[PDB]
Design a protein around this motif. Structure first.
Motif, PDB file in Angstrom:
ATOM      1  N   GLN A 145       0.855  -1.183   0.000  1.00  0.00           N
ATOM      2  CA  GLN A 145       0.000   0.000   0.000  1.00  0.00           C
ATOM      3  C   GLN A 145       0.891   1.233   0.000  1.00  0.00           C
ATOM      4  N   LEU A 146       0.655   2.142  -0.942  1.00  0.00           N
ATOM      5  CA  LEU A 146       1.568   3.254  -1.167  1.00  0.00           C
ATOM      6  C   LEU A 146       1.301   4.399  -0.198  1.00  0.00           C
ATOM      7  N   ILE A 147       2.375   5.088   0.190  1.00  0.00           N
ATOM      8  CA  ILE A 147       2.279   6.121   1.217  1.00  0.00           C
ATOM      9  C   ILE A 147       1.555   7.349   0.682  1.00  0.00           C
ATOM     10  N   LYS A 148       2.003   7.869  -0.460  1.00  0.00           N
ATOM     11  CA  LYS A 148       1.525   9.173  -0.905  1.00  0.00           C
ATOM     12  C   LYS A 148       0.099   9.103  -1.438  1.00  0.00           C
ATOM     13  N   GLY A 193      -2.114   5.957  -1.163  1.00  0.00           N
ATOM     14  CA  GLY A 193      -2.993   5.024  -0.496  1.00  0.00           C
ATOM     15  C   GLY A 193      -3.466   3.886  -1.368  1.00  0.00           C
ATOM     16  N   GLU A 226       6.075  -8.455   7.797  1.00  0.00           N
ATOM     17  CA  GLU A 226       4.857  -7.698   7.574  1.00  0.00           C
ATOM     18  C   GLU A 226       4.929  -6.376   8.327  1.00  0.00           C
ATOM     19  N   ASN A 227       4.261  -5.363   7.774  1.00  0.00           N
ATOM     20  CA  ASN A 227       4.237  -4.015   8.347  1.00  0.00           C
ATOM     21  C   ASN A 227       5.628  -3.386   8.382  1.00  0.00           C
ATOM     22  N   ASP A 228       6.399  -3.585   7.317  1.00  0.00           N
ATOM     23  CA  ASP A 228       7.665  -2.887   7.136  1.00  0.00           C
ATOM     24  C   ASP A 228       7.649  -2.187   5.787  1.00  0.00           C
ATOM     25  N   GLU A 229       8.176  -0.969   5.747  1.00  0.00           N
ATOM     26  CA  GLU A 229       8.071  -0.175   4.533  1.00  0.00           C
ATOM     27  C   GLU A 229       9.136  -0.588   3.523  1.00  0.00           C
TER      28      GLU A 229
END
Ligand SMILES: [Mg+2]
Ligand SMILES: [Mg+2]
Ligand SMILES: [Mg+2]
Ligand SMILES: [Mg+2]
Ligand SMILES: [Mg+2]
Ligand SMILES: [Mg+2]
Ligand SMILES: [Mg+2]
Ligand SMILES: [Mg+2]
Ligand SMILES: [Mg+2]
Ligand SMILES: [Mg+2]
Ligand SMILES: [Mg+2]
Ligand SMILES: [Mg+2]
Ligand SMILES: [Mg+2]
Ligand SMILES: [Mg+2]
Ligand SMILES: [Mg+2]
Ligand SMILES: [Mg+2]
Ligand SMILES: [Mg+2]
Ligand SMILES: [Mg+2]
Ligand SMILES: [Mg+2]
Ligand SMILES: [Mg+2]
Ligand SMILES: [Mg+2]
Ligand SMILES: [Mg+2]
Ligand SMILES: [Mg+2]
Ligand SMILES: [Mg+2]
Ligand SMILES: [Mg+2]
Ligand SMILES: [Mg+2]
Ligand SMILES: [Mg+2]
Ligand SMILES: [Mg+2]
Ligand SMILES: [Mg+2]
Ligand SMILES: [Mg+2]
Ligand SMILES: [Mg+2]
Ligand SMILES: [Mg+2]
Ligand SMILES: [Mg+2]
Ligand SMILES: [Mg+2]
Ligand SMILES: [Mg+2]
Ligand SMILES: [Mg+2]
Ligand SMILES: [Mg+2]
Ligand SMILES: [Mg+2]
Ligand SMILES: [Mg+2]
Ligand SMILES: [Mg+2]
Ligand SMILES: [Mg+2]
Ligand SMILES: [Mg+2]
Ligand SMILES: [Mg+2]
Ligand SMILES: [Mg+2]
Ligand SMILES: [Mg+2]
Ligand SMILES: [Mg+2]
Ligand SMILES: [Mg+2]
Ligand SMILES: [Mg+2]
Ligand SMILES: [Mg+2]
Ligand SMILES: [Mg+2]
Ligand SMILES: [Mg+2]
Ligand SMILES: [Mg+2]
Ligand SMILES: [Mg+2]
Lengths: 61, 70, 118, 263, 188, 595
Positions: B1-4, B6, B24-27
């Motif tokens: 899922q992309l930061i800028k 969504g 999981e849950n690491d960028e």
RNA sequence: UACCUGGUUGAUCCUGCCAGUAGCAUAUGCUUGUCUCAAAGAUUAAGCCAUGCAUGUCUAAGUACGCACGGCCGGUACAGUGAAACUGCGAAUGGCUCAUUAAAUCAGUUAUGGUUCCUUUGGUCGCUACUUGGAUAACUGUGGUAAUUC
RNA sequence: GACGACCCAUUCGAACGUCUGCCCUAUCAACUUUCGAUGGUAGUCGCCGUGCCUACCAUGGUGACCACGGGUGACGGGGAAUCAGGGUUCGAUUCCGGAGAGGGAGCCUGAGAAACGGCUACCACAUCCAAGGAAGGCAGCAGGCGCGCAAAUUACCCACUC
RNA sequence: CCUUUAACGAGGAUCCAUUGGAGGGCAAGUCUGGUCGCAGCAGCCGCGGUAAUUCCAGCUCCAAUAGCGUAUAUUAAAGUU
């Protein structure tokens, strides 16, 4: 071979006259007596906030 | 899922046993696949690949030149 | 906040002051600033009144009437000197000028005089 | 952005005949307001420190000028960005030498030492002739000078030689076909020849032809002609080359055949 | 933003379009081996200069003779090409410029002329001589194996006046192996 | 680099018509674990501190401006200006030494404050990371190019900058340094400036006194004079406010203020009382973990820094979640239904002296299950009468020895104990109610394990006054005589310790006599207050006992101070010693309101 | 240097695209001995800003009663260096950024015979008088406010 | 000699005008007009020409040769990359011109400003307070937070250019 | 900083060159072990199901070289505007 520029002044008073002051200080004839640009700056900006005889900064720094 | 944005995309992790480096849950930083809009190779629906896992590249972890920070 | 003449109220108000007014000093040629001031009507709520004595009474006040006065500075313009010491139209006005005395101890005694203009 | 007049000049935007470098700094002298236009002048600092090498920085030329040594048209100029211009006279009597700013051949000023007896008058081109109160005739020359009571047979584009000490127009040359002239603008900036023609276009830019001392012809606008002699005879002394403009091929032939390398 | 700097620069070479072409590969390696060059960029460089000279020559060659610009720039390009000796003084016309070859410019290098003139035992010895400050062109010591030697300068190449190979104090090796007689077998 | 979490409570954030899009667009809340628990309700939007990864996604898809973005600060080699050893405290960066003005530092125990002063003195080479075998000043000169500390340290090395450091303790060196009476004046750096300092600072009464006969307030004034009379430029005062009375603190602040102007850099450690608005210029805050890491922030103006750091949640660049309301005890709790019986006492009017301290107490009421504190300037006989009533001398005119065993907490904490504090954790023993008393004192936020085993000599002042605390309520006794606890404790520390003493001597129905110098503790420790009046060492009549209100309002009226509440923090501030907000409070006798 | 190569078929000849090839400029990965030159918070948020600095200025030639120093004796335009303050000038230049803006800006070309212009240079200066008036700074002294270049 | 000064000319400009030159769009074909749109006469105002604005008249002006409306991740140009010949794409960016100082608006001084390192209000933010009051504008140089795939030191000096 | 200069400063084992690839396009191996349609590779065609020239490695070799690879915008190739 090494190359530079040279000047011969007709006297020592004329030589003390024109002579950029940093070059006189190469052999003792002048002495740049001050401290630091930032001190001169921050002092001037405190002297701007008082009127009349500025004793706190013309004397007491 | 992309930061800028969504948005939710699907990315590819290319190497032998490089899926172990990605919890999981690491960028992760992903890039393009090489055809500017299209699926490359035999993979359906995928258009990007993963290039960095957490400020460290998947090619330094694949050669041992670096390691994950925990 | 200072009181100012002719703001006819006992309240406090904001005025746009310019050069030539009171309660304001400009910082630049042409500047005007909005400042708060109190009206000139005297009231129970002041911190101070500034009072000047015009007619002296009978009994000398024990704090401000016993002392004496000084000349302070002498007149510097020639016509003021003449009008002060009642000279004539040809009266050599370069000798009736006040000589100020000094004598700060550790230096010789001395007198100064202001340069005369006009 | 620009609410008033500017006072800086960038080194890349300065006139090209000043022959400046591009590595000393971002800025150029920016001549102060004077009798000559900004793009057609030559400041004092550039003439002294760059062409004459008398000074080495701006401080040195400032302290050369602050000793009342330099005289431009007789009077003593203390400013180091004064706009000296065409047909001016520089005088430095501490060394006994006088110059004269005149375009040489290639659209730039030369160093043209002259005799002290020649550094007394100067030639001026008339731009305007009007009448003041009480019917007094006035002149206006190319360097802002105003003369009262000129003889009523001098008109526009004519040349007048004036005494530097007193003004007081001395003699004059008339704009006519057959008179020596130097071009002071455009592409032929510096070339000298005789007129031989004057084409007239009522409403705009009457053009004038010229033919120099070797049979070459070239035209210009009337705004750039400057009569400097009666004919085949200059009134001021001409520089080396005499506005001939030998082509690049002849240039190369004369530079090679003469082998002008050193002494 | 305003600064007293200059930003003028350019590339001096161009890569080949076909990257893996066996003929080009082996022809450029022949040329690297026989002139003792380090890179192929050092071949593409000479190719670039030759291509630009050819472009200028062909450009001048399409104007009509008696054109002043063609005359001037042709007489200048020819003189500048003879000044380095890659053209015979008996040819001196824009038609012969399109007959030059890359090994006329590689010949005129300094590394080539130091070996070819006889100061070295190979081109691979000549490069390390020049790059170690042993070689002098007139009074100058030249450190650069690409120094294109002008014509009149051909006589004057010899060894540096402070170098072992001719009027120089011996190097640090001949002065510890000699100190071996004093500080290697006499003091230790 | 850091950890990122969100704050959500802002203007009219209502899930009533927010459509709860916050949970609709979160990666963590979709994978199963609970991150954002918000449904249409009458509730404020909920968010956790540990479950949300950050990623700003919840911020970009909210219709109302509720969710924001904030950081949690933790160590990741932030230039680590000094390390000691493995798993040991590290400082990150130092402020530039603002010249001509007071640069204060405001921070907690543990976090870096002395380490900064030691490095700015030139006395300690900063470690900047990993070790150098010699202390190599080329590290600090090469690490900080492009900054002002390069020139400052290069001028430190050339002998031109002479730095002076305040001893962090007065009790550490009345053992090695010794100065002979009278000659102790002649030995100082200057002659004519001694008079100016002694006259403004009030050493005048005791210059010719025996230096061993002095009290702690005189040792602080002596330390002050000895430091100030030395001419230099760099000056560091490591907490000059430490155990001085309020008007002593004010004139000491005025005397260091008298030396700001002639270009001499002054850095004061400043967890100080609320006297702020003329006595320091810029302040810097401290952040980090007390036993592990610390950093100093950019310089801030004094009021701005005190307010944002007294609010805690306000600083604009960066934040930390701690520093709740800790300046007082707004959490009101008081109820005494168990007090069906009491064991009161009546002491006679004893009056004593040693050679020059005329003391005299008035016979008064001595309650039980209830507390009493005393106050006054240093030297009015506050420890003297305490330890003489415990007993040293004068069994000549009446006198009742305490039939109760006594707990006693001194002010001169410097134990002679070979071994460790885990030993003296067994001389007195915790064989008592093992319920939270010490774990509720400090177990969670302060790690009392640092006080169980440590080095008794290298212990910080905090943990030192804490072993002073633990020495009292572990020995069988029924009357507490505590003297000056607030020393080397910061705001929450001071308050929590005083409250611990309060409600731990409350439930056991015994009596405490407290010595204090800081107003907030004098208020929240007792309902009875004995006023200590009199001129020191001439006559100090211990006033008859009274209540809290009349006692305090008659006491502080002799110091010419007053205190003002705060409508948003309830934090007491001093006035200027005359002001239109002070004048009526002075004539009305009330020096605090909103009881 | 004016150039092509693989892929639809059992095989062939085409249309036609996908892929390959070389440069250029933003990012990123691995790696880095020497030397000259030198771009650098434009892209997205013309979003928000702690702290310090970036605009001041006197010659012989506008006003010198600061004993602030200081003289060869004093002030008789009055010594001389000269703080402060009044006065004159500059602060509309330079620096930064590219949000707005589509016959608008801008570029070449022409016009002010339809206007204003500190300063510079040159012209112009005659249709109680041996010199007039009072009144503010600095300076001296008393103050007000939590707080300011009040 | 210095300074000051009415007027004219010169210099440095500024402003208003002439001719020609512009990216995509018709799923934009008719647009403009007492809320001046095009022209005429008299005036007000302005440094001056002028619907610039007012009073009274006339009914005009633009368009398939693309008017009018919309979009632009559009400041224009000198220029940059690529290039057999023709072309295609880029130009926030050191020189010239324009515009702006969080968003609008209104002014003082002055030769020159609708100035923001000037002032006065409203809106949006935000600082200190003793709660009465006071103070603000980094798209200047360093630095910081946020945004992001994405961009440097809270250094020294007026020695050079001006 | 460079330049000018002393005094030290090399035996190749370190004063140790990398980045990509070796079926074709496209320069370079049907060499040896491991996996067995899995892991993986592969811009495209295509490799892997027990005797893999393409995967994982060792050895050898090829290309450019203090540089080389990858994602995207754009130009030539495009006579596919
Ligand atoms: Mg005297
Ligand atoms: Mg006079
Ligand atoms: Mg500008
Ligand atoms: Mg100038
Ligand atoms: Mg088919
Ligand atoms: Mg087939
Ligand atoms: Mg392609
Ligand atoms: Mg070297
Ligand atoms: Mg920006
Ligand atoms: Mg600031
Ligand atoms: Mg003076
Ligand atoms: Mg002027
Ligand atoms: Mg001005
Ligand atoms: Mg910038
Ligand atoms: Mg439009
Ligand atoms: Mg047009
Ligand atoms: Mg134009
Ligand atoms: Mg135009
Ligand atoms: Mg004049
Ligand atoms: Mg009309
Ligand atoms: Mg009209
Ligand atoms: Mg119509
Ligand atoms: Mg349109
Ligand atoms: Mg539009
Ligand atoms: Mg735009
Ligand atoms: Mg464009
Ligand atoms: Mg072409
Ligand atoms: Mg542009
Ligand atoms: Mg932009
Ligand atoms: Mg920029
Ligand atoms: Mg223009
Ligand atoms: Mg503007
Ligand atoms: Mg902004
Ligand atoms: Mg003016
Ligand atoms: Mg404005
Ligand atoms: Mg500005
Ligand atoms: Mg302001
Ligand atoms: Mg600003
Ligand atoms: Mg900045
Ligand atoms: Mg700059
Ligand atoms: Mg980041
Ligand atoms: Mg970058
Ligand atoms: Mg960053
Ligand atoms: Mg300078
Ligand atoms: Mg450099
Ligand atoms: Mg390899
Ligand atoms: Mg491979
Ligand atoms: Mg292999
Ligand atoms: Mg291949
Ligand atoms: Mg092959
Ligand atoms: Mg096998
Ligand atoms: Mg095999
Ligand atoms: Mg194309």
């Amino acid at each position: 071979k090494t190359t530079g520029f040279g000047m011969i002044y007709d006297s020592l008073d004329y030589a003390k006259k024109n002579e950029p002051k940093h070059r006189l200080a190469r052999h003792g004839l002048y002495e740049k007596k001050k401290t630091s640009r930032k001190q001169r700056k921050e002092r001037k900006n405190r002297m701007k906030k008082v009127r009349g005889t500025a004793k706190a900064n013309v004397g007491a720094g | 899922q992309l930061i800028k944005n969504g948005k939710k995309i699907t990315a590819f992790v290319p190497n032998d046993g490089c899926l172990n480096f990605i919890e999981e849950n690491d960028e992760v930083l992903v890039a393009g696949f090489g055809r500017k809009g299209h699926a490359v190779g035999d993979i359906p629906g995928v258009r990007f690949k993963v290039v960095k896992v957490a400020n460290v590249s998947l090619l330094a972890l694949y050669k041992g030149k670096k390691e994950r920070p925990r | 906040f200072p009181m100012k003449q002719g703001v006819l109220t006992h309240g406090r108000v904001r005025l746009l002051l310019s050069k030539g007014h009171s309660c304001y000093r400009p910082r630049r040629t042409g500047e005007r600033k909005r400042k708060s001031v109190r009206g000139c009507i005297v009231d129970a709520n002041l911190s101070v009144l500034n009072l000047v004595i015009v007619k002296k009474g009978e009994k000398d006040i024990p704090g401000l009437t016993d002392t004496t006065v000084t000349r302070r500075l002498g007149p510097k313009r020639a016509s003021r000197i003449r009008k002060l010491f009642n000279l004539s139209k040809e009266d050599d006005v370069r000798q009736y000028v006040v000589r100020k005395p000094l004598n700060k101890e550790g230096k010789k005694p001395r007198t100064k005089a202001p340069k005369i203009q006009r | 952005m620009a609410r008033g007049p500017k006072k800086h000049l960038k080194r890349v935007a300065a006139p090209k005949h000043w022959m400046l470098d591009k590595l000393t700094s971002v800025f150029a002298p920016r001549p102060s307001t004077g009798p000559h236009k900004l793009r057609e002048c030559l400041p004092l600092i550039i003439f002294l420190r760059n062409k004459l090498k008398y000074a080495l920085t701006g401080d040195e030329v400032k302290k050369i000028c602050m000793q009342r040594f330099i005289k431009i048209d007789g009077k003593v100029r203390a400013d180091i960005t004064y706009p000296a211009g065409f047909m001016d006279v520089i005088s430095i009597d501490k060394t006994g030498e006088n110059f004269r700013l005149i375009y040489d051949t290639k659209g730039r000023f030369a160093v043209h030492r002259i005799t002290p007896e020649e550094a007394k008058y100067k030639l001026c081109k008339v731009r305007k002739i009007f009448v003041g109160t009480k019917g007094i005739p006035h002149l206006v020359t190319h360097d802002a000078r105003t003369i009262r009571y000129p003889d009523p047979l001098i008109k526009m584009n004519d040349t007048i030689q004036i005494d530097l000490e007193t003004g007081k127009i001395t003699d004059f040359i008339k704009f006519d076909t057959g008179n020596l002239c130097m071009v002071t603008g455009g592409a032929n900036l510096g070339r000298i020849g005789v007129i031989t023609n004057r084409e007239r276009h009522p409403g705009s830019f009457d053009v004038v032809h010229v033919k120099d001392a070797n049979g070459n012809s070239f035209a210009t606008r009337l705004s750039n002609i400057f009569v400097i002699g009666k004919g085949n005879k200059p009134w001021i002394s001409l520089p080396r080359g005499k506005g001939i403009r030998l082509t690049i091929a002849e240039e190369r032939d004369k530079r090679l055949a003469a082998k002008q390398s050193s002494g | 933003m305003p600064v007293a700097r200059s930003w003028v620069c350019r590339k001096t070479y161009v890569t080949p379009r076909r990257p893996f072409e066996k003929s080009r590969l082996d022809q450029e390696l022949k040329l690297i081996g026989e002139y003792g060059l380090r890179n192929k960029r050092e071949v593409w460089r000479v190719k670039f200069t030759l291509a630009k000279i050819r472009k200028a020559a062909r450009e001048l060659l399409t104007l009509d003779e008696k054109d002043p610009r063609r005359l001037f720039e042709g007489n200048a390009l020819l003189r500048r090409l003879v000044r380095i000796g890659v053209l015979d003084e008996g040819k001196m016309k824009l038609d012969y410029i399109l007959g030059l070859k890359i090994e006329d410019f590689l010949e005129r290098r300094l590394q080539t002329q130091v070996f070819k003139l006889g100061l070295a035992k190979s081109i691979h010895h000549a490069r390390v001589l020049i790059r170690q400050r042993h070689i002098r062109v007139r009074k100058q010591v030249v450190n650069i194996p690409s120094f294109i030697v002008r014509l009149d300068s051909q006589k004057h190449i010899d060894f540096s006046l402070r170098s072992p190979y001719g009027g120089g104090r011996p190097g640090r090796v001949k002065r510890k192996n000699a100190k071996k007689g004093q500080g290697g077998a006499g003091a230790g | 680099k850091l950890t990122r979490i969100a704050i959500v409570n802002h203007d009219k954030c209502k899930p009533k018509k927010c459509r709860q899009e916050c949970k609709k667009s979160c990666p963590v809340v979709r994978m199963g674990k609970l991150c954002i628990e918000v449904t249409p309700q009458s509730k404020i939007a909920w968010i956790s501190e540990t479950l949300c990864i950050g990623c700003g996604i919840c911020i970009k898809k909210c219709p109302f401006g509720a969710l924001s973005i904030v950081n949690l600060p933790s160590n990741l080699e932030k230039e680590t200006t000094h390390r000691y050893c493995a798993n040991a405290f590290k400082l990150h960066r130092l402020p530039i030494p603002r010249p001509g003005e007071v640069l204060g530092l405001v921070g907690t125990n543990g976090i870096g404050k002395s380490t900064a002063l030691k490095i700015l003195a030139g006395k300690q080479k900063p470690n900047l990371g990993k070790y150098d075998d010699p202390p190599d000043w080329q590290e600090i000169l090469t690490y900080f190019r492009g900054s002002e500390l390069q020139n400052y340290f290069t001028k430190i090395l050339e002998d031109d900058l002479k730095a002076i450091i305040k001893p962090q303790y007065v009790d550490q060196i009345p053992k090695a340094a010794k100065g002979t009476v009278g000659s102790i004046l002649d030995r100082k750096d200057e002659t004519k400036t001694q008079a100016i300092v002694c006259q403004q600072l009030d050493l005048t009464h005791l210059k010719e006194r025996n230096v061993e006969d002095l009290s702690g307030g005189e040792l602080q004034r002596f330390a002050c004079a000895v430091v100030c009379i030395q001419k230099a430029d760099i000056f560091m005062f490591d907490e000059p406010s430490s155990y001085l009375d309020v008007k002593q603190r004010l004139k000491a602040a005025i005397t260091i203020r008298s030396l700001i102007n002639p270009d001499r850099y002054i850095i004061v450690v400043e967890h100080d009382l609320s006297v702020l608005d003329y006595l320091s210029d810029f302040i810097c805050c401290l952040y980090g973990v007390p036993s592990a890491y610390g950093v100093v922030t950019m310089p801030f103006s004094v009021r701005e820094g005190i307010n944002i750091f007294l609010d805690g949640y306000v600083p604009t660049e960066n934040l930390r979640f701690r520093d709740a309301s800790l300046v007082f005890k707004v959490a009101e709790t008081a109820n005494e239904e168990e007090v069906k019986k009491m064991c009161m006492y009546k002491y006679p009017g004893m009056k004593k002296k040693m050679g020059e301290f005329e003391l005299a107490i008035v016979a008064g009421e001595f309650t039980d299950s209830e507390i009493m504190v005393m106050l006054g300037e240093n030297g009015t006989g506050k420890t003297t009468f305490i330890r003489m009533l415990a007993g040293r001398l004068k069994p000549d005119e009446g006198g009742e020895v305490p039939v109760l065993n006594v707990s006693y907490k001194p002010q001169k904490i410097s134990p002679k104990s070979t071994g460790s504090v885990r030993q003296l954790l067994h001389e007195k023993i915790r064989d008592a109610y093992t319920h939270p008393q010490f774990v509720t004192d400090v177990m969670k936020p302060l790690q009392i394990e640092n006080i169980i085993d440590q080095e008794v000599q290298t212990l910080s002042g905090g943990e030192l006054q804490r072993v002073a605390l633990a020495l009292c309520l572990g020995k069988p006794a029924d009357v507490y005589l505590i003297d000056e606890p607030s020393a080397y404790l910061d705001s929450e520390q001071r308050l929590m310790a005083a409250r611990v003493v309060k409600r731990f001597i409350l439930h056991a129905k015994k009596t405490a006599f407290v010595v204090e110098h800081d107003f907030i503790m004098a208020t929240y420790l007792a309902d009875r207050v004995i006023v200590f009046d009199g001129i020191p060492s001439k006559n100090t009549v211990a006033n008859s006992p009274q209540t809290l209100l009349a006692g305090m309002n008659k006491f502080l009226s002799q110091l010419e101070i007053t205190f003002r509440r705060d409508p948003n923090n309830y934090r007491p501030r001093i006035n200027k010693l005359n002001s239109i907000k002070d004048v009526e409070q002075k004539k009305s006798g009330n020096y605090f309101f909103l009881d």
